[PDB]
Ligand SMILES: CC(C)CCC[C@@H](C)[C@H]1CC[C@H]2[C@@H]3CC=C4C[C@@H](O)CC[C@]4(C)[C@H]3CC[C@]12C
């Protein structure tokens with residue numbers, strides 16, 4: 010079905026390109042404070058800068074390509090939309106592949122651009138000292154839960170009260186996730202974004218957190234929105250058809 | 257009446273869950289600068305980070321659940337809407353109970369997540385040194401007054417000039433309250449948010465400020481908007497019916 | 504005419520109250536970094552914090568009272584609207600009186616709240632070292648020019664392309680003015696806001712800058728918008744009638 | 751054609767004036783942290799402050815003059831719109847001349863205002879230490895690519911899903927570009943803005959980067975949007991007519 014339609018593959022390519030741009034811009038901002046290189050200074054990360062980088066990247070790329078693909082740019086968001094039966098299983102798989110590959114490409118280009126930084130961590134996500142696996146998992150779950158809940162509400166399509174920029178809302182939710190999580194885990198909140206850094210650095214220590222936590226958060230957001238707060242008056246069996254149809 | 261309608265209890269549950277998420281995200285951001293734990297650094301709170309955390313949390317959760325409950329997430333806002341006769345007394349009581357319980361639950365989960373921080377104040381609100389009870393009370397009154405005034409104006413329903421995102425407006429008002437009050441009192445501006453920290457820490461010193469000041473601010477905002485700036489052409493006796501009817 | 508209409512005086516009172524709230528919130532934010540008092544720390548002003556305080560105060564108060572008065576809260580903006588013949592001379596005079604009195608009241612209340620700060624400058628505007636009168640005047644002129652130009656464009660009423668929140672646009676313009684001018688002059692950009700601090704501190708040194716520069720900026724913005732970029736197809740004599748009529 | 755129409759020349763003058771204001775405000779913000787002059791302090795640039803200065807300047811000036819000219823204020827954006835055949839070749843040339851001259855005028859006025867700063871670099875763009883020409887070129891290409899892509903999408907005119915403020919979207923994209931690029935290259939992304947500083951300082955070292963990279967980014971954004979993601983159902987030959995007709 011969608012496999013043979015130009016619009017579907019345009020959406021897949023848009024997801025790939027937008028994820029590449031998002032990862033590159035955001036992680037390049039995160040690495041920015043390490044320059045100048047020679048200057049021996051106790052330069053400290055600016056958390057507001059990084060959070061705004063991620064959030065405004067999401068907002069800008071949503072404004073740019075959401076009408077083409079929905080501007081997921083996040084495997085957790087795609088999983089939320091899959092479980093809320095808004096996209097097909099095939100579209101979800103292709104979107105997640107595109108997001109991961111785009112994150113890998115962005116992080117490789119970034120490692121090329123930032124070659125002067127010694128021991129460049131490439132914005133890899135890991136637990137901060139004093140934060141164990143369960144605590145970082147909880148932080149990741151909550152950040153992804155709020156992001157996916159915002160996405161599910163913003164695109165409900167039963168709503169007539171919405172006003173303003175939906176891309177700005179999603180970008181601000183991403184910025185909020187980062188403001189919460191940068192100090193604890195680096196704020197994965199986006200399994201593809203963490204995967205790119207882990208792959209390029211050849212370091213997967215504690216990496217399962219940044220896949221499991223965001224997916225748990227997305228699943229909980231779907232549960233909360235679709236079955237507790239704003240249920241639909243549609244038989245589940247009918248909604249299941251979207252998985253193999255995309256309609 | 258509303259006690260037996262599924263929509264009402266969905267709104268109550270939405271208020272509980274959204275208050276939990278808001279408190280957790282915001283206070284976790286506020287505690288973030290204390291990590292890493294072992295690193296002996298004179299790390300200093302970033303006030304813009306915390307203010308944006310609170311404000312963007314409110315904006316995101318409003319976008320997510322406002323159509324379900326109105327997204328009060330603040331006992332002072334609920335009291336403002338009660339005194340402006342927009343909600344019933346029962347809905348106000350249930351909303352405030354839900355907000356307090358959600359704040360308690362969020363702060364307990366956070367105390368679990370941040371166990372590595374010694375003497376974790378859990379973002380408890382107290383007067384800064386050089387600020388006595390009356391001065392902090394004034395700061396709290398003004399912050400809550402502007403927040404409640406913005407909420408009352410944004411939802412006037414007599415207005416045809418409104419544009420953009422109402423959730424963003426309310427979140428930005430919350431961020432403004434924090435930008436004002438973090439240095440003086442920690443910016444309660446939200447009696448449930450202060451109550452959760454006070455309950456979890458078992459410390460209620462100067463806690464009456466963070467209930468009285470926000471309620472005085474809400475009452476003053478109601479007085480200003482409903483009886484000075486934008487009066488309604490409706491007999492007060494009719495508006496009183498909403499308290500026992502919710503209509 | 505308007506002298507005997509309840510709506511006009513409601514607008515005047517709204518301008519007074521909103522200017523009071525704006526000045527109090529913003530200058531209280533600006534003074535915040537001096538707390539705690541006893542703590543001997545080389546605490547440094549956060550310019551982003553103060554700029555956002557001013558801008559978001561303007562945005563919130565515009566959302567709250569613009570439909571009641573237009574939410575000028577700035578004598579320079581009122582002068583711009585007077586010279587573009589949108590308000591009457593009487594309304595401009597009453598608005599500017601209300602703005603100045605509200606700024607005075609806010610700064611007095613703030614001086615009460617911040618009594619623990621020794622030598623409290625109360626956010627008074629003055630030239631920074633290395634900035635002479637002409638240079639600060641230029642900074643003030645440009646900041647007020649951009650603010651007044653944004654206000655004139657946002658309320659053109661010939662425009663069908665506008666989208667989003669006009670209050671947010673004006674608040675962001677104010678934030679921009681502060682981001683530019685805080686380091687040079689303290690960013691008056693609002694003669695009433697500077698007047699309140701000057702009156703309460705009993706210090707008027709270089710105060711003429713913060714009245715002249717903003718008025719020059721407003722006049723230049725009116726010239727640019729109304730006579731270079733977006734002229735109206737109306738005889739000037741007809742527009743002059745608004746001064747004595749307000750229509 | 752347009753050469754003899756008052757609207758076209760009003761648009762050109764608007765581009766000149768708005769570019770002047772944008773450059774002045776933004777670079778004056780960037781130079782702000784060097785004041786006070788006498789105070790010997792290890793004052794450090796605030797990257798969030800500068801990024802917001804640039805972005806909010808673009809947002810405010812877009813709101814003010816976009817309906818008059820489209821508020822390009824950036825030769826790279828004008829080139830993107832030229833290659834997407836939305837403007838004529840003549841309008842593009844006049845706009846770029848106006849933008850460059852406005853940047854020069856703004857930087858000259860700023861050098862006058864900031865005369866107390868010794869060795870005033872006037873916000874000139876150059877490569878940071880550890881960043882060679884190719885790496886800075888890549889940063890510039892990506893920043894301009896995201897900006898131009900956002901502009902092309904926001905003004906597609908085939909879109910019915912857009913909501914909120916387009917000026918705010920473009921300003922936030924500019925802020926994102928700065929958050930990415932300030933630490934690497936000083937954040938050009940606007941060849942006129944870099945040209946003004948280079949001309950006033952009489953320093954053109956590595957200046958070709960800040961013309962080539964932004965134009966490559968704009969060209970790639972046009973390619974991506976117009977030929978990969980959102981193609982138009984119009985013969986290229988017809989679109990070429992706009993270059994000599996502006997229609
Ligand atoms: C979207 C694309 C076109 C933007 C980036 C393209 C160009 C400018 C970038 C991408 C990868 C970069 C290269 C990556 C790695 C290095 C190795 C280093 O020892 C010298 C510079 C060099 C050789 C870089 C030069 C600039 C470069 C070629």
Ligand SMILES: CC(C)CCC[C@@H](C)[C@H]1CC[C@H]2[C@@H]3CC=C4C[C@@H](O)CC[C@]4(C)[C@H]3CC[C@]12C
Pocket residue numbers: 141142143144146147148150151365367368369371
């Ligand atoms: C919304 C929910 C599901 C997210 C948080 C859930 C999980 C990941 C969190 C919540 C409470 C957390 C626990 C709270 C307290 C402690 C005690 C400490 O000495 C070891 C870790 C441990 C045992 C935490 C592990 C992680 C934890 C179990």
Ligand SMILES: CC(C)CCC[C@@H](C)[C@H]1CC[C@H]2[C@@H]3CC=C4C[C@@H](O)CC[C@]4(C)[C@H]3CC[C@]12C
Pocket residue numbers: 388389390391393394395397398612614615616618
């Ligand atoms: C909008 C209004 C109601 C909010 C502020 C009202 C109250 C809480 C404020 C306003 C002015 C304040 C007073 C101003 C000055 C001082 C003198 C100082 O040595 C002790 C505290 C004291 C006496 C303050 C106590 C608190 C105060 C009374």
Ligand SMILES: CC(C)CCC[C@@H](C)[C@H]1CC[C@H]2[C@@H]3CC=C4C[C@@H](O)CC[C@]4(C)[C@H]3CC[C@]12C
Pocket residue numbers: 635636637638640641642644645859861862863865
């Ligand atoms: C848009 C315009 C009107 C705003 C700026 C205009 C005025 C206030 C500015 C622009 C250029 C400025 C001058 C530029 C250079 C210097 C040289 C210095 O040694 C003394 C101050 C002096 C002489 C400045 C005084 C103030 C000034 C005249």
